[PDB]
């Protein structure tokens, strides 16, 4: 809750002033975080996909869903229904917790940093972001690794405009370039 707490007094009240939100309800809050990691190399061997699953379960604290192709595509030689990736939605206590971790452990282990981008926003205000390796999280143990592997990390928000979001992020001292 650290940052849920921080959010509930420090963040809300700053943003409160700098936009002149009359209603408090108007203040952007963070809704949910979701961690995709597609694993096309599944159609080759299915063990790989489950091996991802444990990673994403080890990072995040909860079992991932296993996603399947919506339609068949011949481009990648897949057919509708084969498992090809896995996600976790994070919503509460756990969502704020992982977030805390992301900022204050994971992201300053990025092999050579320059912050993150502040360009990656959808236009409504939901921050999307990749990670090249998965050693970034100390949840995993680097000498017990099969492969280098990545994920998306998408922070879905109640922000209305692209801009208004950025503020919400920054106000948690989010490391933008």
């Amino acid at each position: 809750a650290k940052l849920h707490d921080y959010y509930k007094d420090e963040v809300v009240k700053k943003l409160m002033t700098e936009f002149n939100y009359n209603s408090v309800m108007q203040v952007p809050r963070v809704e949910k975080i979701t961690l995709n990691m597609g694993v096309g190399e599944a159609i080759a061997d299915k063990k790989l996909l489950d091996n991802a699953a444990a990673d994403l379960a080890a990072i995040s604290g909860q079992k991932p869903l296993i996603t399947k192709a919506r339609k068949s595509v011949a481009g990648f030689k897949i057919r509708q229904g084969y498992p090809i990736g896995c996600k976790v939605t994070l919503r509460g206590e756990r969502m704020w917790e992982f977030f805390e971790r992301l900022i204050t452990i994971a992201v300053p282990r990025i092999r050579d940093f320059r912050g993150l981008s502040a360009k990656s926003f959808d236009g409504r205000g939901n921050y999307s972001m990749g990670v090249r390796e998965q050693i970034i999280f100390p949840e995993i143990d680097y000498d017990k690794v099969d492969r280098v592997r990545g994920l998306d990390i998408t922070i879905t928000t109640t922000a209305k405009s692209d801009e208004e979001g950025r503020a919400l992020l920054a106000a948690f001292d989010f490391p933008f370039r």
Binding site: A57, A58, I59, G61, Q62, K63, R94, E97, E100, R101, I103, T104, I105, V107, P108, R109, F113, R114, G115, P138, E139, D173, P175
Partner: protein, 67 residues
């Protein structure tokens, strides 16, 4: 939250270099000794420069010292 399908998720302690210590919930299952927290980091702190370009003329006048 469903029962007995998810991994253990517990308190630990995460001691940086700069003495910085933070109780945190994680699977990892034992206390960490990490080396660069969000306080110990060039970028967050404000350190990293951007590589000094445009030295050729400074170089040359430093190198030779000739009228």
């Amino acid at each position: 939250m469903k029962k007995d399908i998810h991994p253990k998720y517990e308190e630990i302690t995460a001691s940086c270099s700069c003495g910085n210590v933070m109780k945190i919930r994680s699977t990892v299952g034992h206390d960490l000794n990490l080396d660069v927290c969000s306080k110990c980091h060039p970028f967050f702190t404000g350190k990293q420069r951007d590589v000094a370009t445009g030295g050729r003329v400074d170089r040359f006048n430093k190198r030779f010292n000739i009228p």
